[PDB]
Amino acid sequence: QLPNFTAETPIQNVILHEHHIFLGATNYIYVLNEEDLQKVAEYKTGPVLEVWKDNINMALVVDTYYDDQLISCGSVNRGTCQRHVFPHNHSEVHCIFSEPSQCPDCVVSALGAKVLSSVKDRFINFFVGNTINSSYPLHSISVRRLKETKDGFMFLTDQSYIDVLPEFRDSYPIKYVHAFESNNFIYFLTVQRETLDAQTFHTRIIRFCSINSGLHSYMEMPLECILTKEVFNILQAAYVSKPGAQLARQIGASLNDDILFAVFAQSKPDSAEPMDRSAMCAFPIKYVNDFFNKINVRCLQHFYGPNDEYRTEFTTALQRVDLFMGQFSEVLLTSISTFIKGDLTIANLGTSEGRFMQVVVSRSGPSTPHVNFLLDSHPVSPEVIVEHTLNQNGYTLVITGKKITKIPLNGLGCRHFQSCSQCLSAPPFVQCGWCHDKCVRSEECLSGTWTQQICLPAIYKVFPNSAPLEGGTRLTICGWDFGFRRNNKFDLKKTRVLLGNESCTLTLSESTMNTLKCTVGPFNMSIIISNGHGTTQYSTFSYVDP
């Protein structure tokens, strides 16, 4: 259906650079063509030996500051990077490698790494987070600059890195989930122990700045996404972008404001593994920095130990609430992107079982995913791209195993909606209407009865059939389209039930667009239900006497 490319081996990283896609895969680096994901070039980083190993890609960093080129780091030769220079408007691949107390040209851990890259003051700087156990140095949080000679990196001072005390190296590890630069700071997102020798696990955000190779304002802060009071402690994925106007007003953000859309999971007992239970909330950066600039804190334990520049830490987690109000409570969300259409904020997500889906994100309440299907059975990776611009309708590159797919930002038509309500619940830019018996587009309408506003009720049973005289029994009215469409949403606000001559007191807090609950009493009567639009009938309910 939509453009997709399958590789010979798993895809680890994807960057886009002037209409060309770059894939970081095991033993290969692919160069697809944005338009149709067609494979234009490749490079076999191959199976390297030293006793054969596989070269799992750990990073891609393009930079055209000096000259148009692509830097890539593998997991074989102690995380060593290599230059790929383009020959004009477009094989000539260099390498970075030179008394062994330290090793800067050794950049990346095979245990997991994240690499930022920013030309601060005439030089390219690599900010890197490495997971690690026992073995002869790779640093856990480093900033090694590359020289204009282009053949090797170099640390400046002792402060150029922050690591883990050798005594706690293997004991308790730190996974770097995601990293980004914003507001003139650098940010790393982690999953690590709550405290040294503690059985549970955390999600933390890291911040610092850079001077030469500064890392000068270092600080760690815990982040929690709780449900209304169940805690989701393990960050699974995290994307960073601007908010749509709607979402913003609610959270007190401005249109250029950066926001952290993080997907958390509920972890297993005393573990860092996730259960099939997911949540999501948004962290406004400035909001975060607001706390980072106030004064209850200890001295970074995994750095100093229990006892100029302080590397510090907070001892109480900031926490927000799930924007899906428990919608994904029993699924494992493993990937997140975020784009704006209209005033709306839409998140395209991914299951731990291969389900891409797009969802209107609102502080007011969850909406029903207008897209929701099966990419392959392989779990979706948190590695994603979002190319969307004006005069255009954009797309998302999503990776599932060896495959990467280009998915439109307007969803995939209306044909898949089951009833008038879901059909009419879709976001304006999908352009769906109801046509009596099917959901579909405007100009494709059979009978001239296309509507984007109107739905009529329909009953399909009641429980129970009869009911005692004075008895205020609960009536359960099963059916369809019992709700009304105001603003751009559906609810049972105007919904009414009539028992022939007398009204039937609905409890709204317990009723859905498909199920009505209301107390009845004080025959052979007709029940009439109106959703505000029209009415329907049921001539069965009797006021019996035992």
């Binding site: 609610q250 007190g252 506003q453 109107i454 105001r486 603003n487 606000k493 105007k494 639009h533």
Partner: protein, 287 residues
Amino acid sequence: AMETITVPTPIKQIFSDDAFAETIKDNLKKKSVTDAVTQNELNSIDQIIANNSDIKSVQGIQYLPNVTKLFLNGNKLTDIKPLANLKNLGWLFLDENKVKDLSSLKDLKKLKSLSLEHNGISDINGLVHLPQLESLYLGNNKITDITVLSRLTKLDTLSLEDNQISDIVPLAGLTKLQNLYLSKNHISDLRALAGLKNLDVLELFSQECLNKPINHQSNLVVPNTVKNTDGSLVTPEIISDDGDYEKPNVKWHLPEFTNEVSFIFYQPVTIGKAKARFHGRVTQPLK
């Protein structure tokens, strides 16, 4: 029936509105609007369902005395006088019209349900004539003063979302309220809703409180005016321009002049059996 036709007449001549006639035609199962109908047929009508049908006048509606159900959202109506003498009217729905002259309903003493969202309505003092109302949907209008709602004490369901109410004191006694919707207004203080022990569903999201202009100062201090149901200040969630909350004060540092500042608040509430989230943004103009 005071109003009535004496001899068989074509529908097209009773009901002037091209569309509304065609609505009748379908309702009484006729074939053409030219076809005749007798007063008899006109009296067998209990309900009219005509949403988004481009109705600009309900002229001829007076000869339908037994009608009890009207669904007329999505039309161009602006004159409801033809309705005034339909004694048997109970449900009447006119959203997305332009009817602002609610004084025509003064004698619909059987009217229980009234929907009038999206009409451009400022003055709803006409409502003083319908105490028996059980359900009122005045959402999405220009209503500022809801003093008149004091008298509708039989409402079990009221909706005023999306207007310009800041003063809800007139709601204090409507104990028989079960469903109350107040989002998108200017509510600053929920002291008014204290006694509504019958509520089951309540909404209070996205308020928009605005303050009177203030001389900007380099170290501004704006008092917290948001108040919870009991009277207690509600601690601010987020403050613009790197501001702080040293209760009961909001503080800024403004080394340079800016048009305004502001802070969003978020306060989970519970009234009776209802669980809502009182939330919104306070805006402070500066000069």
